[PDB]
Structure 1
């Protein structure tokens, strides 16, 4: 059968790993490929070098029907090599299964490779701490069978359903935290169930690439030479990480901008509660969707070096360019960082958190369970004095 590789991800981390897989296989210029990476654009100077390369929009975390137009161009027997975001795997594969239904004679699923979205998978797993995980797996497997037979989605445990694909297809899972699955006691049944179908995320794959493939990869992920040089000075580095807000209200976005500037000052100013000392070069890493929030920092701070905000932070993990220290507002990007590199992580007030909620939320709990952070490194945003 002819193999078609599908790279699907609405987010960042899976895409980063999928673009590594493409780079590792980039000598094959005609292997059929379909890219559905909402946050990444393959430069046309690379697209033109490949044949049978296709692109599909994602909408509501699934490929659009435009996928069918692509697959119709391959009228023989086809086996699908599918790369997915774990958290969104059920929706991402939905149009693929629908197409297979219409072409059961010639379309088969060869294998799945699944990659963590980031913190969201582990948080979601925390909320299942009190469940009979062994029973949830069996039910999820049963309901995955119904999905595969009817095309209709109904999971009593949508979270555990993300981890039962091996009951249907050859699968390999790539986890940001293998420790979590091995340390969390309530997850022991799941760890044993997954058996030899998971592995730790290949963060050091970039180091095994060829010199030219390394440059290939950096072009795919938007990390140009100028930014690289900046993060290679022989100086103690601290990177301040920013955040964003859904709200459109100018007013509110302005408050988030003013408050993130204040948080920066708590790290970098001597009177600050989070002062890291005088011996660090300071970088700012805005949130990709920060918009004016990011401009507020650069326009009103000083002695800071900007790292373009649309770069996914996790690139620095995939490339070995992490700083000595990272600090800022809680983000998925922290789940993937070494413990000794964390200064302080700050939390924003919302529905569940109106105080340093005794750290009774899953995010901190996961991090503490894994030992990435201690209580002294958790900060509630509103408790910080206005400097």
Structure 2
């Protein structure tokens, strides 16, 4: 009798897509919505415009028990419209399925919309190169049935399991690279299975919105006039892109900071192996979770312009503000960049990430550079 919409993501790229869906549907002010986005905070003056709007924390890649308190407020027949991170889909839906068990008479799942975490899904798929993919799919379907019927998780192939939701629900997949599913010949049985249930992430969606909706969207993603003006400068531009480590430990985080600064110097100094030229204006776009690694760059480099780390690179493409050249450590941002704009991509210290980028033609056949092979300058 009533639809409720849920938006869930611990990372960056699925949340960016989901905030576009919310913008497209923003005229309806009373439609029930539940936001679980770890990296995005919806501004207060947008929140006040809406009724039946809710928020939930994620812990260990799943909504917390606070979800159940929200759902208890809707005592009629309810249908759930769910948006999810692909790599983390099994854990993110876990508490939703548990609630459904308790209220079988009134709670149903209407549909799923799923979006890539990023490079993770592709590096993971590359590791499956030698397997019988057709057989893997049939087994994953069986094991998904057990999850839906019992509530217990056990998959022989956690990677392939991410792609079999259509056997239970109406679904739509949104991929960072549809080309990968064409070019990886071993994956043909998966492409065939998915049929009409997938599309590429649509980076032209912003252009189709009204002026009012475009402003609404830029507010959601943290884009502001000051950043816009810094990129409208009349000079050739280079953006240095940063990385992070999910290692908590001090020793590794400090090493990443040191090697990343040395890498910057190889682009910007005359004696550097990757010298771009004296005529470029230099920018820094740190990783959203770089933390102290980002601070090390700003503290120890000179003549560099910061772009706030929380702003997703892809927003620059949407707004038509891409620079001449882009360089740094391998990132998901490089998957949707025009090839003319790539300077050098460096890998961290046969490598599956290297293989993925080679298949897609993002890098060529020449020997790749790992950052521990670079001379310590100065």
The answer to whether the superposition gives a TM-score over 0.5 is yes
Unmatched segments (≥5 aa) in structure 1: 351-360
Q: Per-residue deviation at 1:287?
A: 2.0
CA contact (8 A) 1:345 1:377 kept: no
After superposing the two structures, state which structure 1 stretch, 223-232 or 100-109, moved more.
223-232
Seen in structure 2, the aligned counterparts of structure 1 residues 279 and 378 have a Cα distance that, compared at 3 Å, is farther
SS at structure 1 position matched to 2:322: coil
CA contact (8 A) 1:343 1:377 kept: no
Partner of 2:195: 195
CA contact (8 A) 2:259 2:372 kept: no
CA contact (8 A) 1:79 1:107 kept: yes
CA contact (8 A) 1:344 1:377 kept: no
CA contact (8 A) 1:344 1:379 kept: no
In structure 1, C-alpha distance between the alignment counterparts of 2:138 and 2:319, rounded to whole Å: 39
- Deviation track 1:177-217 (CA, whole Å, cap 9, x = no partner) reads 00000111000000010001000001111111111211111
In structure 1, C-alpha distance between the alignment counterparts of 2:208 and 2:365, rounded to whole Å: 37
Q: Per-residue deviation at 1:237?
A: 1.8
Alignment of 1:275-354 (within 5 A): 275-349=275-349
Q: TM-score, normalised by structure 2?
A: 0.96
Seen in structure 2, the aligned counterparts of structure 1 residues 60 and 239 have a Cα distance that, compared at 3 Å, is same
After superposing the two structures, state which structure 1 stretch, 246-255 or 210-219, moved more.
246-255
In structure 2, C-alpha distance between the alignment counterparts of 1:321 and 1:378, rounded to whole Å: 29
After superposing the two structures, state which structure 1 stretch, 339-348 or 17-26, moved more.
339-348
In structure 2, C-alpha distance between the alignment counterparts of 1:199 and 1:187, rounded to whole Å: 16
After superposing the two structures, state which structure 1 stretch, 49-58 or 204-213, moved more.
204-213
In structure 2, C-alpha distance between the alignment counterparts of 1:366 and 1:40, rounded to whole Å: 29
CA contact (8 A) 1:35 1:55 kept: yes
Q: Per-residue deviation at 1:334?
A: 2.2
In structure 2, C-alpha distance between the alignment counterparts of 1:68 and 1:329, rounded to whole Å: 41
After superposing the two structures, state which structure 1 stretch, 367-376 or 252-261, moved more.
252-261
Q: Per-residue deviation at 1:344?
A: 1.1
SS at structure 1 position matched to 2:369: strand
Partner of 1:90: 90
Unmatched segments (≥5 aa) in structure 2: none
- Deviation track 1:228-279 (CA, whole Å, cap 9, x = no partner) reads 2222333322110112234555555333323211111111112111111233
In structure 1, C-alpha distance between the alignment counterparts of 2:290 and 2:101, rounded to whole Å: 41
CA contact (8 A) 2:235 2:280 kept: yes
Q: TM-score, normalised by structure 1?
A: 0.93
After superposing the two structures, state which structure 1 stretch, 295-304 or 182-191, moved more.
295-304
In structure 1, C-alpha distance between the alignment counterparts of 2:34 and 2:96, rounded to whole Å: 12
After superposing the two structures, state which structure 1 stretch, 370-379 or 33-42, moved more.
370-379
Q: Per-residue deviation at 1:284?
A: 0.3
In structure 2, C-alpha distance between the alignment counterparts of 1:180 and 1:330, rounded to whole Å: 17
CA contact (8 A) 1:100 1:108 kept: yes
CA contact (8 A) 2:124 2:159 kept: yes
* Count, aligned residues: 377
- Deviation track 1:323-362 (CA, whole Å, cap 9, x = no partner) reads 2221111223223322222111112219xxxxxxxxxx11
CA contact (8 A) 1:13 1:314 kept: no
CA contact (8 A) 1:243 1:331 kept: yes
